[PDB]
């Protein structure tokens, strides 16, 4: 989206209730700088944060470093956004989005893209169906879960069946 300006009233939004796909933001040709301070970018997209903060502003070719340590000088301490202990990325392209990552009391919403392998039945496997975890053979079931129930539990609290989260079919786990 076009037009951008101002750093001191630099505009800022919570990013929340969405899956934060940072994957696309490497692969485009046009980014010239992408960094992280503290943790790797593919290592970012498997954490799970309450509030992803983003903000943007237009700049001149020669750019002063956006502040990792509390960087030192002129506009880089007299106009903005000076996070000494910044566990926060810095993007740029041919114009920057400086990212602060909140981990506050709230239930973490803006969470990794959760990349998903492809179902294999009738053999043995370690499975992770939506955070439910454990080894077994998944086979086609005849059980009829109600629309909102995600996993069947046996009499003695052992998981007996699951709903596959992408095709909403019920698999027994023997």
């Amino acid at each position, epitope marked *: 989206a076009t037009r951008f300006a101002s750093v001191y009233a630099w505009n800022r939004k919570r990013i929340s209730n969405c899956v934060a796909d940072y994957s696309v933001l*490497y*692969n*485009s*040709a*046009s*980014f*010239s*700088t*992408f*960094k*992280c301070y503290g943790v*790797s*970018p*593919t*290592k970012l997209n498997d954490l799970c944060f309450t509030n992803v903060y983003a903000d943007s502003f237009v700049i001149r070719g020669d750019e002063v470093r956006q502040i990792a340590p509390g960087q030192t000088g002129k506009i880089a301490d007299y106009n903005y956004k000076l996070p000494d202990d910044f566990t926060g990325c810095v993007i740029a392209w*041919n114009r920057v989005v400086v990212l602060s990552f909140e981990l506050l009391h709230a239930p973490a919403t803006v969470c990794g893209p959760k990349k998903s392998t492809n179902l294999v039945k009738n053999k043995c496997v370690n499975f992770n169906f939506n955070g439910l975890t454990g080894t077994g053979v998944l086979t086609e079931s005849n059980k009829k879960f109600l629309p909102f129930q995600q996993f069947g539990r046996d009499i003695a609290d052992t998981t007996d069946a699951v709903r596959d989260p992408q095709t909403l079919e019920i698999l027994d786990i023997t």
Partner: antibody
Amino acid sequence: QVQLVESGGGVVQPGRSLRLSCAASGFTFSSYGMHWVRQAPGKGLEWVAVIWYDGTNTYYADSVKGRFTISRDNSKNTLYLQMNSLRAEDTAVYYCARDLAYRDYVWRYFDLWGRGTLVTV
Amino acid sequence: EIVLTQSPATLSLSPGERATLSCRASQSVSTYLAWYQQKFGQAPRLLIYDASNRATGIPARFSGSGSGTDFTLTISSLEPEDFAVYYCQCRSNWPPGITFGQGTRLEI
């Protein structure tokens, strides 16, 4: 003495496997990203693999997708590269290279080249 | 995908004269597309990025022009410090790899 020296040039039949290594020295191995670019005889440079400075994510060119393995062990400050299912085109001068940018994930330029090790099949 | 198309196949000239290579990009490549100078056996070194921006270590004699699908390099006065082979290079988004050209040889 900021140089890389390659290692592991040799000959193998098609369908078998090979492993190369590149030694880095004079600079911080675990602070820069690394590439392997291969120069087939009489032809131009063709990127093979890259790694960001902490080896936490890796990309391969299409011609080698799912057939070669790039890895860094900072214990010895040694870069590796395994091979599987090598074919006739794979003959080349494998130049391990070092990335241009300090701690930037763009992975865009090659600022430093190894002398290149022959591999033939 | 981006395929760089390089002309002429070769250049033959005396040193001191004006050397012009052309690289016709397939489709606009935004603000960075590179030129590589490789002497025989040596390690290739960038000369120009952005197609007019003078990279560091580069004497002023090397000049480039273009945007979109016209990209051309000029050298005003050749000396043996420059007499090598030359490539035009870029990176990609559709899937994440890199395209060089085929190369353009220079002759005396």
